Amino acid sequence: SRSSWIKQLNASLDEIDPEVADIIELEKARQWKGFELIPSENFTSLSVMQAVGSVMTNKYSEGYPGARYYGGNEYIDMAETLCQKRALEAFQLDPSKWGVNVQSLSGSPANFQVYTALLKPHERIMALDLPHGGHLSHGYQTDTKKISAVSIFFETMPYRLDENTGYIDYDQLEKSAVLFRPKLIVAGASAYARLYDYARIRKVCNKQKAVMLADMAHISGLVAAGVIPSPFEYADVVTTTTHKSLRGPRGAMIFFRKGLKEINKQGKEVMYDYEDRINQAVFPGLQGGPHNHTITGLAVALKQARTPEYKAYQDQVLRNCSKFAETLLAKGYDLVSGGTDNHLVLVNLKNKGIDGSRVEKVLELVHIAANKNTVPGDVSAMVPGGIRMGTPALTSRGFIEEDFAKVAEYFDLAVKIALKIKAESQGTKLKDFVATMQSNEKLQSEMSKLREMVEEYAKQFPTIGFEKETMRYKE
Amino acid sequence: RSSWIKQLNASLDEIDPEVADIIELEKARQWKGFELIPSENFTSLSVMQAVGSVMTNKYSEGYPGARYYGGNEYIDMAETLCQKRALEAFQLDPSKWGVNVQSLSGSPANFQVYTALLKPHERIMALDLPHGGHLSHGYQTDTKKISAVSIFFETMPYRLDENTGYIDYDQLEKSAVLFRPKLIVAGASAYARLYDYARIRKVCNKQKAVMLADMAHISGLVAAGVIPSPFEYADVVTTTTHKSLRGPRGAMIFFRKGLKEINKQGKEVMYDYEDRINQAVFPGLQGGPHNHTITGLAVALKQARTPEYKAYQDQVLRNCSKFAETLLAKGYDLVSGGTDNHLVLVNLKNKGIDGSRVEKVLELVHIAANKNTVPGDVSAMVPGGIRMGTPALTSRGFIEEDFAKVAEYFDLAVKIALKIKAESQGTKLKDFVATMQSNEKLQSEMSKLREMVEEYAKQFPTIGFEKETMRYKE
Amino acid sequence: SRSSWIKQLNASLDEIDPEVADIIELEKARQWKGFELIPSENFTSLSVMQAVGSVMTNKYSEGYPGARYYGGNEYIDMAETLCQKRALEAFQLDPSKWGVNVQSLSGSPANFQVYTALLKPHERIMALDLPHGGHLSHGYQTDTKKISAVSIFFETMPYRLDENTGYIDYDQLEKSAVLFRPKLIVAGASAYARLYDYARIRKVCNKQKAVMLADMAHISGLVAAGVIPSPFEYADVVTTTTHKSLRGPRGAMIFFRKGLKEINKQGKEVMYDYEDRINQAVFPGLQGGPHNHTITGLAVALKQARTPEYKAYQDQVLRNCSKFAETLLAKGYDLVSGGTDNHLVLVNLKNKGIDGSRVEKVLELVHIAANKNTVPGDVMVPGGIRMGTPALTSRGFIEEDFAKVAEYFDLAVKIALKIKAESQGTKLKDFVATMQSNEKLQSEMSKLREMVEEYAKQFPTIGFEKETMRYKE
Amino acid sequence: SNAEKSRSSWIKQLNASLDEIDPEVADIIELEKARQWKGFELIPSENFTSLSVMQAVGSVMTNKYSEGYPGARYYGGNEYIDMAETLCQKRALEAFQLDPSKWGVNVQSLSGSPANFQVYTALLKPHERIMALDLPHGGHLSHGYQTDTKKISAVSIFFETMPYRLDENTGYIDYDQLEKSAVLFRPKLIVAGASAYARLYDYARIRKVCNKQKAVMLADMAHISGLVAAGVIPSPFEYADVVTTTTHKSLRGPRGAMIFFRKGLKEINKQGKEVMYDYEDRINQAVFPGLQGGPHNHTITGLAVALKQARTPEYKAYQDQVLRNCSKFAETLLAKGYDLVSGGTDNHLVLVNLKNKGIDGSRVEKVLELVHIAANKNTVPGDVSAMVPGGIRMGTPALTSRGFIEEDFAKVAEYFDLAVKIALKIKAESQGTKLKDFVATMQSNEKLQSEMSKLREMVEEYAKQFPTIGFEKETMRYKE
Ligand SMILES: [Cl-]
Ligand SMILES: [Cl-]
Ligand SMILES: [Cl-]
Ligand SMILES: [Cl-]
HEC sequence for C39-86 = CCCCCCCHHHHHHHCCHHHHCCCCEECCEECCCCCHHHHHHHHHHHHH
Are C247 and C44 contacting, i.e. CB atoms less than 8 angstroms apart? yes
State yes or no: cis peptide before B283, omega within 30 of 0: yes
User: In the annotation, is A207 catalytic?
Assistant: no
Are D75 and C370 a contacting pair at CB < 8 A? yes
Calpha distance A202→A210 (Å, rounded): 9
Catalytically annotated residue among A116, A156, A241, A340: A241
Calpha distance D29→A329 (Å, rounded): 84
Calpha distance B263→A160 (Å, rounded): 50
For D52, which DSSP code?
Answer: H
A97 is in an annotated binding site: no
Are A371 and B22 a contacting pair at CB < 8 A? no
C63 phi/psi in degrees, rounded to 5? 105, -155
Calpha distance A101→B318 (Å, rounded): 41
Q: What burial class does residue D73 get, using C-beta atoms within 10 Å of its C-beta: 0-12 exposed, 13-18 middle, 19+ buried?
A: middle
**Contact residues, chain B, for A51 at CB < 8 Å:** 12, 16, 19, 23, 52
* Consecutive H or E run containing C150: helix C150-153
Tell me the CATH number for domain D60-310.
Answer: 3.40.640.10
Calpha distance B47→B53 (Å, rounded): 10
Q: Please state, in angstroms and as integers, the Cα–Cα distance from residue D31 to each residue in C297, D252, D368, D398, D464, following that order.
A: 16, 22, 20, 18, 14
Q: How far is CA A106 from the centre of its chain?
A: 10
Ligand lying nearest the CA atom of residue C391: 3
CATH class of residue range A55-305: alpha beta
Are D126 and C153 contacting, i.e. CB atoms less than 8 angstroms apart? yes
D244 phi/psi in degrees, rounded to 5? -105, 155
Chain D touched by A430 (CB under 8 Å): no
Give the β-pairing of C334-335 and C269-271: unpaired
Q: How far is the CA of B217 from the centre of ligand 2 (A)?
A: 8
Residue among A140, A184, A171 nearest A158 (CA): A140
Q: Beginning with the edge strand found earlier in the chain, give each strand of the sheet holding A371-373 in spatial order.
A: A334-335, A344-348, A386-390, A371-373
Residue among A295, A239, A207 nearest A111 (CA): A239
Q: Tell me, in Å, the resolution of the deposited structure.
A: 1.6
Are A398 and A382 contacting, i.e. CB atoms less than 8 angstroms apart? no
**HEC profile of chain A:** CHHHHHHHHHCCHHHHCHHHHHHHHHHHHHHHHCEECCCCCCCCCHHHHHHHCCHHHHCCCCEECCEECCCCCHHHHHHHHHHHHHHHHHCCCCCCCEEEECCCCCHHHHHHHHHHHHCCCCCEEEEECHHHCCCHHHCCECCCCECCCHHHHCEEEEECECCCCCCECHHHHHHHHHHHCCCEEEECCCCCCCCCCHHHHHHHHHHHCCEEEEECCCCHHHHHHCCCCCHHHCCCEEEEECCHHHCCCCCEEEEEECCEEEECCCCCEEECCCHHHHHHHHHHHHCCCCCHHHHHHHHHHHHHCCCHHHHHHHHHHHHHHHHHHHHHHHCCCEEHHHCCCCCEEEEEHHHHCCCHHHHHHHHHHCCEECEEECCCCCCCCCCCCEEEEECHHHHHCCCCHHHHHHHHHHHHHHHHHHHHHHHHCCCCCHHHHHHHHHHCHHHHHHHHHHHHHHHHHHHCCCCCCCCHHHCCCCC
**Contact residues, chain C, for D291 at CB < 8 Å:** 108-109, 112, 149
Contacts of D468 (CB under 8 A, 6+ apart): D33, D36, D37, D402, D476
- Active site members of B: 59, 61, 214, 240, 243, 249
Calpha distance A28→A468 (Å, rounded): 9
Calpha distance A67→A83 (Å, rounded): 16
* Consecutive H or E run containing C108: helix C107-118
Calpha distance A417→A428 (Å, rounded): 16
C461 phi/psi in degrees, rounded to 5? -80, 145
Q: Which of residues 153-182 of C touch D (CB under 8 A)?
A: 153
Catalytically annotated residue among D65, D69, D172, D175: D65
Calpha distance C264→B163 (Å, rounded): 37
Out of A122, A158, A181, name the one closest to residue D184 (CB): A158
**Contact residues, chain A, for B249 at CB < 8 Å:** 57, 289, 291, 293
User: In the annotation, is D246 catalytic?
Assistant: yes
For C140, which DSSP code?
Answer: -
C45 phi/psi in degrees, rounded to 5? -70, 155
What are all long-range contacts of A332-341, with beta carbons under 8 Å and residues at least 24 apart? Answer: A333/A412, A335/A193, A336/A166, A336/A193, A336/A375, A336/A376, A336/A386, A337/A161, A337/A165, A337/A166, A337/A167, A337/A193, A337/A194, A338/A165, A338/A166, A339/A193, A340/A193, A340/A194, A341/A193, A341/A194, A341/A195, A341/A228
**Contact residues, chain A, for B16 at CB < 8 Å:** 47, 51, 299-300, 303
Classify the C-alpha dihedral D382-D385-D391-D397 as positive or negative: positive
Single-letter amino acid, residue B460: F
C142 is in an annotated binding site: yes
Chain C nearest-CA distance from D175, in A, is 27
Tell me the CATH number for domain B54-304.
Answer: 3.40.640.10
For D72, which DSSP code?
Answer: E
B106 is in an annotated binding site: yes
Contacts of D389 (CB under 8 A, 6+ apart): D360, D361, D362, D377, D378, D379, D380, D383
Contacts of A60 (CB under 8 A, 6+ apart): A70, A289, B37, B39, B40
Contacts of B208 (CB under 8 A, 6+ apart): none
Are A157 and D185 a contacting pair at CB < 8 A? yes
Q: Which residues pair with C422 in a beta bridge?
A: none
What torsion do the CA atoms of A318, A322, A323, A324 make, to the nearest 10 degrees? 100
